[PDB]
Enzyme design. Sequence first.
Site, PDB file in Angstrom:
ATOM      1  N   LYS A   1       0.814  -1.209   0.000  1.00  0.00           N
ATOM      2  CA  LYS A   1       0.000   0.000   0.000  1.00  0.00           C
ATOM      3  C   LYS A   1       0.850   1.263   0.000  1.00  0.00           C
ATOM      4  O   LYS A   1       0.535   2.220  -0.713  1.00  0.00           O
ATOM      5  CB  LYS A   1      -0.933   0.010   1.213  1.00  0.00           C
ATOM      6  CG  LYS A   1      -1.908  -1.153   1.255  1.00  0.00           C
ATOM      7  CD  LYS A   1      -2.620  -1.233   2.593  1.00  0.00           C
ATOM      8  CE  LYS A   1      -1.739  -1.857   3.658  1.00  0.00           C
ATOM      9  NZ  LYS A   1      -1.981  -3.317   3.784  1.00  0.00           N
ATOM     10  N   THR A   2       1.927   1.285   0.788  1.00  0.00           N
ATOM     11  CA  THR A   2       2.793   2.458   0.817  1.00  0.00           C
ATOM     12  C   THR A   2       3.453   2.688  -0.535  1.00  0.00           C
ATOM     13  O   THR A   2       3.532   3.828  -1.010  1.00  0.00           O
ATOM     14  CB  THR A   2       3.853   2.299   1.905  1.00  0.00           C
ATOM     15  OG1 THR A   2       3.226   1.932   3.140  1.00  0.00           O
ATOM     16  CG2 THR A   2       4.616   3.597   2.096  1.00  0.00           C
TER      17      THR A   2
ATOM     18  N   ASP B   1       0.487   7.726   5.874  1.00  0.00           N
ATOM     19  CA  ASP B   1       0.563   6.275   5.801  1.00  0.00           C
ATOM     20  C   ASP B   1       0.595   5.679   7.201  1.00  0.00           C
ATOM     21  O   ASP B   1       1.179   6.256   8.122  1.00  0.00           O
ATOM     22  CB  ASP B   1       1.796   5.833   5.012  1.00  0.00           C
ATOM     23  CG  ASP B   1       3.089   6.191   5.707  1.00  0.00           C
ATOM     24  OD1 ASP B   1       3.114   7.216   6.420  1.00  0.00           O
ATOM     25  OD2 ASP B   1       4.080   5.451   5.538  1.00  0.00           O
ATOM     26  N   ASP B   2      -0.039   4.516   7.351  1.00  0.00           N
ATOM     27  CA  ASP B   2      -0.094   3.805   8.625  1.00  0.00           C
ATOM     28  C   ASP B   2      -0.756   4.672   9.699  1.00  0.00           C
ATOM     29  O   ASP B   2      -0.138   5.082  10.683  1.00  0.00           O
ATOM     30  CB  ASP B   2       1.309   3.357   9.050  1.00  0.00           C
ATOM     31  CG  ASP B   2       1.339   1.927   9.562  1.00  0.00           C
ATOM     32  OD1 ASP B   2       0.401   1.156   9.265  1.00  0.00           O
ATOM     33  OD2 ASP B   2       2.311   1.568  10.256  1.00  0.00           O
TER      34      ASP B   2
ATOM     35  N   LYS C   1     -11.317  18.189   6.843  1.00  0.00           N
ATOM     36  CA  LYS C   1     -12.558  18.854   6.474  1.00  0.00           C
ATOM     37  C   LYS C   1     -12.417  20.343   6.206  1.00  0.00           C
ATOM     38  O   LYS C   1     -13.308  20.916   5.570  1.00  0.00           O
ATOM     39  CB  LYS C   1     -13.608  18.653   7.575  1.00  0.00           C
ATOM     40  CG  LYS C   1     -15.041  18.642   7.079  1.00  0.00           C
ATOM     41  CD  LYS C   1     -16.026  18.556   8.235  1.00  0.00           C
ATOM     42  CE  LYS C   1     -15.902  17.242   8.994  1.00  0.00           C
ATOM     43  NZ  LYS C   1     -15.978  16.056   8.098  1.00  0.00           N
TER      44      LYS C   1
ATOM     45  N   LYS D   1       4.980  -8.837  -0.364  1.00  0.00           N
ATOM     46  CA  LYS D   1       6.132  -8.708   0.524  1.00  0.00           C
ATOM     47  C   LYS D   1       6.525 -10.060   1.109  1.00  0.00           C
ATOM     48  O   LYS D   1       7.710 -10.422   1.146  1.00  0.00           O
ATOM     49  CB  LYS D   1       5.811  -7.707   1.633  1.00  0.00           C
ATOM     50  CG  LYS D   1       7.016  -6.999   2.221  1.00  0.00           C
ATOM     51  CD  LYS D   1       6.580  -5.841   3.105  1.00  0.00           C
ATOM     52  CE  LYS D   1       7.661  -5.437   4.087  1.00  0.00           C
ATOM     53  NZ  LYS D   1       7.120  -4.587   5.180  1.00  0.00           N
TER      54      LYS D   1
HETATM   55  N1  LIG Z   1       3.101  -4.354  -7.687  1.00  0.00           N
HETATM   56  C1  LIG Z   1       3.687  -4.061  -6.523  1.00  0.00           C
HETATM   57  N2  LIG Z   1       3.007  -3.306  -5.633  1.00  0.00           N
HETATM   58  C2  LIG Z   1       3.585  -3.008  -4.468  1.00  0.00           C
HETATM   59  N3  LIG Z   1       4.792  -3.359  -4.020  1.00  0.00           N
HETATM   60  C3  LIG Z   1       5.443  -4.105  -4.917  1.00  0.00           C
HETATM   61  C4  LIG Z   1       4.978  -4.493  -6.162  1.00  0.00           C
HETATM   62  N4  LIG Z   1       5.924  -5.263  -6.822  1.00  0.00           N
HETATM   63  C5  LIG Z   1       6.922  -5.320  -5.974  1.00  0.00           C
HETATM   64  N5  LIG Z   1       6.702  -4.640  -4.805  1.00  0.00           N
HETATM   65  C6  LIG Z   1       7.618  -4.528  -3.676  1.00  0.00           C
HETATM   66  O1  LIG Z   1       6.887  -4.904  -2.523  1.00  0.00           O
HETATM   67  C7  LIG Z   1       7.128  -3.957  -1.469  1.00  0.00           C
HETATM   68  C8  LIG Z   1       5.902  -3.963  -0.597  1.00  0.00           C
HETATM   69  O2  LIG Z   1       6.222  -3.367   0.677  1.00  0.00           O
HETATM   70  P1  LIG Z   1       5.365  -2.181   1.268  1.00  0.00           P
HETATM   71  O3  LIG Z   1       6.169  -1.346   2.182  1.00  0.00           O
HETATM   72  O4  LIG Z   1       4.727  -1.427   0.107  1.00  0.00           O
HETATM   73  O5  LIG Z   1       4.194  -2.927   2.041  1.00  0.00           O
HETATM   74  P2  LIG Z   1       2.962  -2.514   2.963  1.00  0.00           P
HETATM   75  O6  LIG Z   1       1.679  -3.001   2.428  1.00  0.00           O
HETATM   76  O7  LIG Z   1       3.056  -1.009   3.194  1.00  0.00           O
HETATM   77  O8  LIG Z   1       3.329  -3.216   4.334  1.00  0.00           O
HETATM   78  P3  LIG Z   1       2.940  -3.149   5.879  1.00  0.00           P
HETATM   79  O9  LIG Z   1       1.497  -3.646   5.931  1.00  0.00           O
HETATM   80  O10 LIG Z   1       3.883  -3.963   6.693  1.00  0.00           O
HETATM   81  O11 LIG Z   1       2.967  -1.657   6.216  1.00  0.00           O
HETATM   82  C9  LIG Z   1       7.242  -2.656  -2.242  1.00  0.00           C
HETATM   83  O12 LIG Z   1       8.103  -1.831  -1.469  1.00  0.00           O
HETATM   84  C10 LIG Z   1       8.073  -3.079  -3.453  1.00  0.00           C
HETATM   85  O13 LIG Z   1       9.404  -3.196  -2.971  1.00  0.00           O
HETATM   86 MG   LIG Z   2       3.175   0.664   5.263  1.00  0.00          MG
END
Ligand SMILES: Nc1ncnc2c1ncn2[C@@H]1O[C@H](COP(=O)(O)OP(=O)(O)OP(=O)(O)O)[C@@H](O)[C@H]1O
Ligand SMILES: [Mg+2]
Lengths: 536, 290, 245
Positions: free
Chosen positions: C54-55, C108-109, C136, C213
């Site tokens: 998501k980030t 984020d978060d 708002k 991840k």
């Molecule tokens: N299509 C994709 N979308 C997102 N991330 C991807 C993709 N392909 C590869 N990645 C890799 O996967 C990583 C996912 O880690 P990320 O920090 O975005 O997870 P998160 O959902 O924020 O995690 P958490 O829930 O622990 O906060 C991205 O940083 C990138 O390195």
């Molecule tokens: Mg995150």
Amino acid sequence: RQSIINPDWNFEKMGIGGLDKEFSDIFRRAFASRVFPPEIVEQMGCKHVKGILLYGPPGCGKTLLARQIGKMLNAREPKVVNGPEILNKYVGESEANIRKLFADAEEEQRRLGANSGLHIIIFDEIDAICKQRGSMAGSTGVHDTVVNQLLSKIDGVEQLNNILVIGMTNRPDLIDEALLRPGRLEVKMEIGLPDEKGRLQILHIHTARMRGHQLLSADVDIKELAVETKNFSGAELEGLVRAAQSTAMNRHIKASTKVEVDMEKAESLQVTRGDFLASLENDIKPAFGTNQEDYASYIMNGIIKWGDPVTRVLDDGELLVQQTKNSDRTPLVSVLLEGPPHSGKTALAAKIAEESNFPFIKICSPDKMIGFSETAKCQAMKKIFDDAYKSQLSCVVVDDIERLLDYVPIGPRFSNLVLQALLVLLKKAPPQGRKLLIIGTTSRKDVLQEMEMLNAFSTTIHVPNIATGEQLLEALELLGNFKDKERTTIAQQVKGKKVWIGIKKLLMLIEMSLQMDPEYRVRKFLALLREEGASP
Amino acid sequence: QSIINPDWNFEKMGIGGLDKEFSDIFRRAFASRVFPPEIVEQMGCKHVKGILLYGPPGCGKTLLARQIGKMLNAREPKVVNGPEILNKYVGESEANIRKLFADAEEEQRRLGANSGLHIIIFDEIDAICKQRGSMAGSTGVHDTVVNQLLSKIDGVEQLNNILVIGMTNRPDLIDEALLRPGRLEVKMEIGLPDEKGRLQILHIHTARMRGHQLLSADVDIKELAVETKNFSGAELEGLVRAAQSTAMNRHIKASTKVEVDMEKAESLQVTRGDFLASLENDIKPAFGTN
Amino acid sequence: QEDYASYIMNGIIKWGDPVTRVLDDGELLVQQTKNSDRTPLVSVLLEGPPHSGKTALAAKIAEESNFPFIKICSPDKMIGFSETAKCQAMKKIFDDAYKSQLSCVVVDDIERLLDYVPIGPRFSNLVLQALLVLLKKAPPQGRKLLIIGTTSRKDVLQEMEMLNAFSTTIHVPNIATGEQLLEALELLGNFKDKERTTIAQQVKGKKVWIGIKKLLMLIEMSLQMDPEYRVRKFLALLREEGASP
Ligand SMILES: Nc1ncnc2c1ncn2[C@@H]1O[C@H](COP(=O)(O)OP(=O)(O)OP(=O)(O)O)[C@@H](O)[C@H]1O
Ligand SMILES: [Mg+2]
Ligand SMILES: Nc1ncnc2c1ncn2[C@@H]1O[C@H](COP(=O)(O)OP(=O)(O)OP(=O)(O)O)[C@@H](O)[C@H]1O
Ligand SMILES: Nc1ncnc2c1ncn2[C@@H]1O[C@H](COP(=O)(O)OP(=O)(O)O)[C@@H](O)[C@H]1O
Ligand SMILES: Nc1ncnc2c1ncn2[C@@H]1O[C@H](COP(=O)(O)OP(=O)(O)O)[C@@H](O)[C@H]1O
Ligand SMILES: [Mg+2]
Ligand SMILES: [Mg+2]
Ligand SMILES: [Mg+2]
């Protein structure tokens, strides 16, 4: 026409090792315009750089750099300021002292112009006089009035092109921001701890005048010294050499009956490896990282292989350390060691950390912060973690998590600030190209599950208890107690059932049993074991 | 012309129960100043210029410093009593600090490598020297003093004929930048003595009385050593002093009008009764049992 | 640069339609905030299970736009801060954002900003109220602002009555089929040749519920054995950790 470098010069002469890159950058950005033919330099319209700042932890070779820079130049003797030496009681005389350092430069420029020599000024502990403006709200405002004079004189309405100021500090976060803009102090180096090759060079520089007179035995080998010396600065290496020399000298001196020095055997002086080892193990001690006296405190009674679980845990740790070392997609790795109380988690974690041969190793236990509040604990944890971000690859241990945050089943009551700090610090990667490993130990897995803290960890390892008569007999045999016939009896009444006991409690029971008279020891041991009867 | 006094022996020092500490101090700080000059010159080594002493109160840290100062035939030591260097006018505390090192620089410039040792003693070092950026030095004298001291001990200019001794009970406020191998290397802990140390102390203190037949044969020193446990060095002296005070007060008979019975003072001696009474009533150890 | 290169570390690959769908929706929202007259303030919430990327997607959506001002407010910079300091930092960031003709802010978060723990539960009210008020209020006349929020627990936000302050929510799912897993492995180039053939033969059926991840972590953990045991270890890890939805 006259050159600004002395006719006789050599990088080896000065005697500084382990900072080749820093010197190269300094020479490129500072003294490149003073060596090229004047005609080309004068056709670009470029003003020479007139400021340098060096900072770092104590003992990493800053004043040495400044002294050698001053000695190198074929200019007048540098004017040094020994800390806050420009302060006076009378009103308006503090500034008049900081304005007399630039008189010769201005006069010479106004006299010859564009062909005058360099005027070097050295500031020691620049943080003593030059600090933020508006802070130190005391009285007499003398501090705020000196910074203004220094800024206005470094570069103002009047132009100067034959000066160069060098500053050195250990706290570069307090210097004023308007003194660091390009033009006042442009070059900002950073002197850090040496690497293994730097350690070898430093050691070989300080052991060059002894080998040249057959004063050092061939037994000593420098590679071993460079290997064992971990987290050592140049000053500490020099101190180690000095201590070795002193202990070598002391053997020829008789005390307690006045001071008498033998003049006969003094012509056969030698320095042995034993002296170096003793000096290393007695007096000299670094102050960055973790030392052997800590492993000797956590792994108290060693490790004994009473069953395959120990080998399994050690192999898993080996695989994890290898992965973090070689892998590049995952610079951060975590692991959790879980099990019942009195199992041996802390010792195993310490052994796994020790057998990794990483440069930086640290242990963050909760018995160094007795009585601390939440903020103090958070600050201590942050400080311990920050240092691991200034290395190349590091490992950290967090043992007894349930004590770091004050858990108590009644309530329940605990700390939220520390829990959130931990949850944030377990997912933040270090700077680019750096690697970290975290090993956490606990004894209450379900509670961590309820806090959503069991998914922040990458994996988990289980440390079990003794659960069979054969394992108990093997442990007793390896320990070295209840031998010959006394052992057989224990085997007769134990093999026909199961047991559930840790290793710490086993040592405690043995020690309790040994205090009785010889005859009732086995009976007391069996009774104590039967009292501690339970199961999952 | 060695720095050592022409007549100095450890027996005359008057310190008992600190053999290992003194041996280590002598080995580390006074070993390179007694070896033949040529060999030391060939080795190419710099001398140590710092000593720190710490431990529980009353264990012999000032006595050791004073006796070390008296050991060396090189000028006389320069003492600093607590925060004796502190003024109100701006820029005067550091001026006070800079006057302590003047003669060392002057003699180093004039003579070079043929100078004599210069000593400086800092009683209660943690009164002025403390961690920078921790104590709220609103005026700013505290940080500035530490900076001046640091820049004067180990700076751009090099000195080779100084030695600094510091004594402190709280060895944690001290700055980390002042306890590195460059500035202050040797650091020692003085702790409570064991049975042999207590025996040595008691033998040292009751030495003049035995010479003049002022001690009765009824008193034994082994019993005194055994019966007293966890006594520091400053309490055995107090016990002896209390015993002597009681013994002398026995003769004096005066309540309202002071009067000394010189007749009874002709034969004076101290028995076990005085020591036992002092042990029971007067002296109370701090690390012992009450 | 530091934040941009630290958040999107391993790039963004295309393992399925959802990536394209999310990117298109983000682009549409950016266009809407660019040329709107009655709606100068627009917000969106990216929602999904943990370890779904998501980030990275939020940062990429922000990057695709060329707004002169872009900022990311994350808890990594507020370790040990009391609620007052958190409120001050958020207020300062938004105040700085209020001085431009175009802006974009990422939060984020969220659940780590309110200090939420499910035992009781316990959280902080000052930060919650500040966030409910800052979602708002419109900026000074003739200006625009866009806020992108990320969370992993929608029910908690819904209970606090925060899901109505936002304008829309977009769902970020994880791998849920063998075809997607095989395509993701192909686009990464880790298992190839007969190894991928046996993996494909075994994977067919039972579906999968692994995020990106976790997949990247399990692919690296498996490559630390000998060549003959890598496939078996990877399959065992996937079977065990994979769990069920
Ligand atoms: N299509 C994709 N979308 C997102 N991330 C991807 C993709 N392909 C590869 N990645 C890799 O996967 C990583 C996912 O880690 P990320 O920090 O975005 O997870 P998160 O959902 O924020 O995690 P958490 O829930 O622990 O906060 C991205 O940083 C990138 O390195
Ligand atoms: Mg995150
Ligand atoms: N094979 C072994 N594994 C672990 N510890 C061992 C082993 N053999 C001997 N020991 C010793 O047993 C003791 C183990 O105690 P340890 O500190 O590891 O307990 P713990 O699990 O941390 O307990 P606590 O519940 O009190 O935190 C240490 O002295 C360790 O040296
Ligand atoms: N890089 C180095 N090369 C050679 N010697 C060094 C180096 N760093 C430190 N030393 C030794 O340690 C001492 C360092 O003192 P100094 O650098 O003046 O301390 P600080 O940098 O804290 O002011 C010097 O006497 C020098 O002999
Ligand atoms: N090791 C020792 N040997 C002989 N006398 C001692 C010893 N230690 C302490 N004393 C006596 O006790 C007193 C100690 O006082 P002092 O040295 O000022 O203690 P400190 O400086 O540690 O507070 C001195 O008067 C000394 O006579
Ligand atoms: Mg210096
Ligand atoms: Mg433990
Ligand atoms: Mg004293």
